[PDB]
Design a protein around this ligand. Structure first.
Ligand SMILES: Nc1nc2c(ncn2[C@@H]2O[C@H](COP(=O)(O)OP(=O)(O)OP(=O)(O)O)[C@@H](O)[C@H]2O)c(=O)[nH]1
Ligand SMILES: Nc1nc2c(ncn2[C@@H]2O[C@H](COP(=O)(O)OP(=O)(O)OP(=O)(O)O)[C@@H](O)[C@H]2O)c(=O)[nH]1
Ligand SMILES: [Ca+2]
Ligand SMILES: [Mg+2]
Ligand SMILES: [Mg+2]
Lengths: 440, 57, 421
C-alpha cells in the first residue's frame, strides 16, 4: 500500500504525464504493453513500484493516473500513441470545447459539465487502493483548464478525501513559450483558490527550464518535447523515494515535514544536476561534490529567483545512483564554508539527505546524457516569493485598466474574485517577508 | 477536536463551493439575459421601421 | 471547437469569398470537384474547420452564399471553384439593394433573412462542435453592408455563445465614387461595435495605395485588390487551418487579441506584397497595412504575427524581440507580453517565406475618423436622407450611429493616452 494517484490536467499536465510515465516505465523495466518480466507476483503485490502502478491478472501494470482535458486533441495522442495499451480508456477523459485560456470557463462554465465524471473515475482508482497516501496534480498555471479546472478539482478532492495529501506540479508561465496574454490572471486566480487545498507545490518555471535547455543541452530553440523530458527527470527524482526500495532512502513525506513550516509556506525550490549533453559528458565523470555544488548555482534551479539574496528554512538533497553518505558529507562541509547559505534564526541548519541506489535513466533519442549519479535539491527559501512578485506585477498592470476582465465577467465571475485573489497573493508575499525576519 | 476541525474544513469547502457555483450561474444567465434583451429590442425597433414605411404611404 | 461556418454577402463579400476558397482549397489540396489531391497529412488534419465530408470522399465548403442581386450567383458558379459549393446553400433574392443600407437591414433584406437563417441552422446543426461564424462583406454597399449586419444580429440571437468574426471591407472614394458609402459604413460600424467579437478592417484605400505605389499598377481593378485580400485572409486563418499552439480557435484568438469588448477592430498586414529580419520590419511598417493607418500615430494593445515557410525559429524569436525593444513606445506598457508569434511550416503558393500581421492598434481611429469626416460632410446639411427616411428610418438612428463611432474613437484615444503609473 501507500498508493499515490497522479492527476494530469490540461495540455501541459497531460504532456508532462506522457514524459513522466514513459520515464517511470523505463526505470522499472515495464514494457509499452504493460508487462514487467522481472515482476514474478502476477495480478498484484506490495512492492515499491506498486505505489504508482496497479496490476491486472493478465500481468499488465497500469499507471494509477487520470488524464483530464476539456478538449480531445492532446489526450487523443495518448490514446493512439506508443503507450496506448498502458491505460484503460476510462483513465483518459476528454470534453469537446476547451476553456480558451480562461479560468472562468475551466472552473465554472465548461468545467462543471465534466467534474462529476472526473471524480467518479478518480474514485475507481481510489477503491483499487488498500492504503491511499494522496494525489499528485500536474497542471499549468496559465491555461484555462490547468488553472480553472484544477482549482475546481482540488476543492472537490478536499470534500471527497478530507485532508488526505495533495501535491502539485505547477507549470509557471514564461513569454518564450506562453500562448496567452491573460496567464497572470489565471495564475493568480488558481494560486489563490488552490492554496488552502494543497499541501506542497513544486513550481516549474518554463523560462528556467527553457534557459537550461539552451545553456546546458545546446538546443537552439527548445520545444515542449525538450522541456518535458527535463521536467520528468526532476519529477522522477522527487517521486523516486516513493517508487523504489532502499536502506538509505528517505520518504517524500519525511522531506515535507522539514519543507513546510506553516501551511501557506508550501512551495519548495527545486534544483537539479547534472544537466549535460552526451558530447560534454564523454570522458567527464561528475563527482558527488561537483553535482552537489551545482545545486547552489542558481542557473540550475526550476524557478528563476536568487536564494543568495534570501534566507533558508530548509535544505534537502535527494540523491540517486552511485552515491554513499561519506561523499555527500564531505561535499556539504565544502559548500557550508564556500557559499551563501543563510538560514533564518528559528530553523536548524542541518541538510537532510536521501539516496536511491537505482541510477538515473534516459528516454531513448533524448538530449540528456546518461550519468552514473544525479541529485535534486529541494529547498525552502524566501527567494521563491520573487516568482510571485514578478507574476503579481503583470496582474496589476492589466487589472488596473481592467484589460481582458470582460472575458471572465461574461462567463460569470465578479471583480470581487480578482481583488480577493490579488489580496491573498499580497498576503502570501507578506508571509514570505515575515518568516525571514529575525525573532525578538 | 481533530475530527471536529477536519469535518469543519470539509463542510465549509462544500458550502463555499456551492455558493460560488450558484452565484456564477446567476451572473452568467443575467449577462446572457441582458444580451438577448438588447437583441430583442432591435426586433421591436425594426418593427417600428417597417410600420413607419407602410403608415407613410 | 473545430467547425467554422462561412457566410458571404453582396458583390464584395462573394468575390473576396470566392478568392478565399480558391487559395485555401489549393493549400489543402482540393480540386474544383472537391477531391483530395496533395501529399502531406497536415493538409487534412484540420480540414473539418472549413469543409464538410460528403459521400465518395468529397470535401464541400461550409459556405453560405447570399445576395439580394442575382447575377452574382452566376459569376461564383462559373468561377474556377464554382462546382465545389453546395447548391442548396445559394440563397439569392430578386430586385437587389442598389447601395442602400435600409433596404439591406430593415425592409428588402429582412424578407430574405429567414431563408438564409434556414441554411445557417442546417449547417450549424451538423457541426460536431461549432466554434463560430465568419462573414465576408463590404460596408459601403447595400446587401453586405445592411443585410450582412442584420444576419450578424440575427445569428447572435440563436448562437450567443459562438464567435462572430468578420472580414469587413471599408469603402474609399479612390476605388468607388458612389456618394452614399460613408452613410452605409457608419451605420454598419454601429452594428459591428455591438454585435461582433472580432472584425478585420480590410480597407480599400490601403489596398489601392498598395497596388499603385508598391505593386506598380497605374489604375487597379477589383481583381488586383483581391489578390492582397485573399493573401491576408489565408494568413490570418493559418492558425485555425493547420496544427499549432497559438490562436488555434476563434475564442483563443479573441481572448488574446481583444482587451476591451468594443475595441475589436484589427489592422491586417502581409509581407512580402527574402530574409527573416526584412519580413519582420516589413510587416510592422505602415506601407504593408491593409488598413490605411500609421501605427506610429498610436500604440498596439495587442499583436499577432504569423510566419509561414521553412525558417530558423531562433531567428524569428530574436527578430520579434528586436522590434519590441526598438519600437517599445508603440506597445502599451500596461499589457505585458502582448505580441504573440506562431510559425507554420507550409508556405503559401508562389512565395517560399511570408509573414501575416494582425494588430489591435489605437491608430485604427484614423480609419474611423476618415469615415466620420465623409459622413458629417453629408449629414449636417441633411443630404441624401430620402433614400433612408423613405424606407422607414428616423434621423435619431443616424445620429446614434455617428455618436457610437465617435465614442469608439474616444475610447481608442483613452487607452492610447493611458500609462502604467
Ligand atoms: N512545460 C510545458 N509547458 C506547457 C506544455 N504545454 C503547454 N504549456 C504551457 O502551459 C500554458 C498554457 O496552458 P495549457 O496547459 O496549454 O492550456 P490548458 O490547461 O489545456 O487550458 P485550455 O487550453 O485553455 O483549456 C503556457 O504557459 C504554456 O507555455 C508542455 O508540454 N510543457
Ligand atoms: N476589395 C474589394 N472591394 C469591392 C469588391 N467589389 C466591390 N467592392 C467594394 O464594395 C463597395 C460596394 O459594395 P458592394 O459589395 O458592391 O454592394 P453589395 O453589398 O453587393 O450591395 P448592392 O450592390 O446594394 O446589392 C464599394 O466600395 C466597392 O469598392 C471586390 O471584389 N474587392
Ligand atoms: Ca507484483
Ligand atoms: Mg488546452
Ligand atoms: Mg450588388
Amino acid at each position: 500500500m501507500r498508493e499515490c494517484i497522479s492527476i494530469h490536467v490540461g495540455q501541459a499536465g497531460v504532456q508532462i504525464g506522457n514524459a513522466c510515465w514513459e520515464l517511470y516505465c523505463l526505470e522499472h523495466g515495464i514494457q509499452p504493453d504493460g508487462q514487467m518480466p522481472s515482476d514474478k507476483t502476477i495480478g498484484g503485490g506490495d512492492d515499491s513500484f506498486n505505489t504508482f502502478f496497479s496490476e491486472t491478472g493478465a500481468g499488465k501494470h497500469v499507471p494509477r493516473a487520470v488524464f483530464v482535458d476539456l478538449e480531445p486533441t492532446v489526450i487523443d495522442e495518448v490514446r493512439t500513441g506508443t503507450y496506448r495499451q498502458l491505460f484503460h480508456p476510462e483513465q483518459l477523459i476528454t470534453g469537446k470545447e476547451d476553456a480558451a485560456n480562461n479560468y472562468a470557463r475551466g472552473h465554472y462554465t465548461i468545467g462543471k459539465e465534466i467534474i462529476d465524471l472526473v471524480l467518479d473515475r478518480i474514485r475507481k482508482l481510489a477503491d483499487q487502493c488498500t492504503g491511499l497516501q494522496g494525489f499528485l496534480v500536474f497542471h499549468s498555471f496559465g491555461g484555462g483548464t490547468g488553472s480553472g479546472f484544477t482549482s475546481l478539482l482540488m476543492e472537490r478532492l478536499s470534500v471527497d478525501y478530507g485532508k488526505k495529501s495533495k501535491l502539485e506540479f505547477s507549470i509557471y508561465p514564461a513569454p518564450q513559450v506562453s500562448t496567452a496574454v491573460v496567464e497572470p490572471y489565471n495564475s493568480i486566480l488558481t494560486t489563490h483558490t488552490t492554496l488552502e487545498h494543497s499541501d506542497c507545490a513544486f513550481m516549474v518555471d518554463n523560462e528556467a527550464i527553457y534557459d537550461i535547455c539552451r545553456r546546458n543541452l545546446d538546443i537552439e530553440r527548445p520545444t515542449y518535447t525538450n522541456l518535458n523530458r527535463l521536467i520528468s527527470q526532476i519529477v522522477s527524482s522527487i517521486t523516486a523515494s516513493l517508487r523504489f526500495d532502499g536502506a538509505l532512502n528517505v520518504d517524500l513525506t519525511e522531506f515535507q515535514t522539514n519543507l513546510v513550516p506553516y501551511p501557506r509556506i508550501h512551495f519548495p525550490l527545486a534544483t537539479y544536476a547534472p544537466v549535460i549533453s552526451a558530447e560534454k559528458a564523454y570522458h567527464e565523470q561528475l563527482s558527488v561534490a561537483e553535482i552537489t555544488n551545482a545545486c547552489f548555482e542558481p542557473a540550475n534551479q526550476m524557478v528563476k529567483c536568487d536564494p543568495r539574496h534570501g534566507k533558508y528554512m530548509a535544505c534537502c538533497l535527494l540523491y540517486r545512483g552511485d552515491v554513499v553518505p561519506k561523499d555527500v558529507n564531505a561535499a556539504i562541509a565544502t559548500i557550508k564554508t564556500k557559499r551563501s547559505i543563510q538560514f533564518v534564526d528559528w530553523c536548524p541548519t542541518g541538510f537532510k539527505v536521501g539516496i536511491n541506489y537505482q541510477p538515473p535513466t534516459v528516454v531513448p533519442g533524448g538530449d540528456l546524457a546518461k550519468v552514473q549519479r544525479a541529485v535534486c535539491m529541494l529547498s525552502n527559501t524566501t527567494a521563491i516569493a520573487e516568482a510571485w512578485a514578478r507574476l503579481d506585477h503583470k496582474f496589476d498592470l492589466m487589472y488596473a485598466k481592467r484589460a481582458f476582465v470582460h472575458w471572465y465577467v461574461g462567463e460569470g465571475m465578479e471583480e470581487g474574485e480578482f481583488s480577493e485573489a490579488r489580496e491573498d497573493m499580497a498576503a502570501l508575499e507578506k508571509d514570505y517577508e515575515e518568516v525571514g525576519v529575525d525573532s525578538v | 477536536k481533530a475530527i471536529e476541525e477536519n469535518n469543519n474544513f470539509i463542510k465549509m469547502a462544500k458550502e463555499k463551493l456551492a455558493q460560488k457555483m450558484e452565484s456564477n450561474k446567476e451572473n452568467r444567465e443575467a449577462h446572457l439575459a441582458a444580451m438577448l434583451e438588447r437583441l430583442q429590442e432591435k426586433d421591436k425597433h425594426a418593427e417600428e421601421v417597417r410600420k413607419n414605411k407602410e403608415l407613410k404611404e | 471547437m473545430r467547425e467554422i461556418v462561412h457566410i458571404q454577402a453582396g458583390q464584395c463579400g462573394n468575390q473576396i469569398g470566392a478568392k478565399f476558397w480558391e487559395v485555401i482549397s489549393d493549400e489543402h489540396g482540393i480540386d474544383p470537384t472537391g477531391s483530395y489531391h496533395g501529399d502531406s497529412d497536415l493538409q487534412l488534419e484540420r480540414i473539418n474547420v472549413y469543409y464538410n465530408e460528403a459521400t465518395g470522399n468529397k470535401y464541400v465548403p461550409r459556405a453560405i452564399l447570399v445576395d439580394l442581386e442575382p447575377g452574382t450567383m452566376d459569376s461564383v458558379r462559373s468561377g474556377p471553384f464554382g462546382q465545389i459549393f453546395r447548391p442548396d446553400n445559394f440563397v439569392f433574392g430578386q430586385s437587389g439593394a442598389g447601395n442602400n443600407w435600409a433596404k439591406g437591414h430593415y425592409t428588402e433584406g429582412a424578407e430574405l433573412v429567414d431563408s438564409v437563417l434556414d441554411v445557417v441552422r442546417k449547417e450549424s446543426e451538423s457541426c460536431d462542435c461549432l466554434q463560430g461564424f465568419q462573414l465576408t462583406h463590404s460596408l459601403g454597399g447595400g446587401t453586405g453592408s445592411g443585410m450582412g449586419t442584420l444576419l450578424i444580429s440575427k445569428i447572435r440571437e440563436e448562437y450567443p455563445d459562438r464567435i462572430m468574426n468578420t472580414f469587413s471591407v471599408m469603402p474609399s472614394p479612390k476605388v468607388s465614387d458612389t456618394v452614399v458609402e460613408p452613410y452605409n459604413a457608419t451605420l454598419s460600424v454601429h452594428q459591428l461595435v455591438e454585435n461582433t467579437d472580432e472584425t478585420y478592417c480590410i480597407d480599400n484605400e490601403a489596398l489601392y495605395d498598395i497596388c499603385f505605389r508598391t505593386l506598380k499598377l497605374t489604375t487597379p481593378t477589383y481583381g488586383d485588390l483581391n489578390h492582397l485580400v485573399s493573401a491576408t485572409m489565408s494568413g490570418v486563418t493559418t492558425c485555425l487551418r493547420f496544427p499549432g499552439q497559438l490562436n488555434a480557435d476563434l475564442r483563443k484568438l479573441a481572448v488574446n487579441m481583444v482587451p476591451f469588448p468594443r475595441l475589436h477592430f484589427f489592422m491586417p498586414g502581409f509581407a512580402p506584397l527574402l530574409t527573416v529580419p526584412e519580413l519582420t520590419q516589413q510587416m510592422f511598417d505602415s506601407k504593408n497595412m491593409m488598413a490605411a493607418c500609421d501605427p506610429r500615430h498610436g500604440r498596439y494593445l495587442t499583436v499577432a504575427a504569423i510566419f509561414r515557410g521553412r525558417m530558423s525559429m531562433k531567428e524569428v524569436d530574436e527578430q520579434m524581440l528586436n522590434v519590441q525593444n526598438k519600437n517599445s513606445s508603440y506597445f502599451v506598457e500596461w499589457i505585458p507580453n502582448n505580441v504573440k508569434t506562431a510559425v507554420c511550416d507550409i508556405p503559401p503558393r508562389g512565395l517560399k517565406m511570408s509573414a501575416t500581421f494582425i494588430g489591435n492598434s489605437t491608430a485604427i481611429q484614423e480609419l474611423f475618423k476618415r469615415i466620420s469626416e465623409q459622413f458629417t460632410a453629408m449629414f449636417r446639411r441633411k443630404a441624401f436622407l430620402h433614400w433612408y427616411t423613405g424606407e422607414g428610418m428616423d434621423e435619431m438612428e443616424f445620429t446614434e450611429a455617428e455618436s457610437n463611432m465617435n465614442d469608439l474613437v474616444s475610447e481608442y484615444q483613452q487607452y492610447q493616452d493611458a500609462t502604467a503609473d
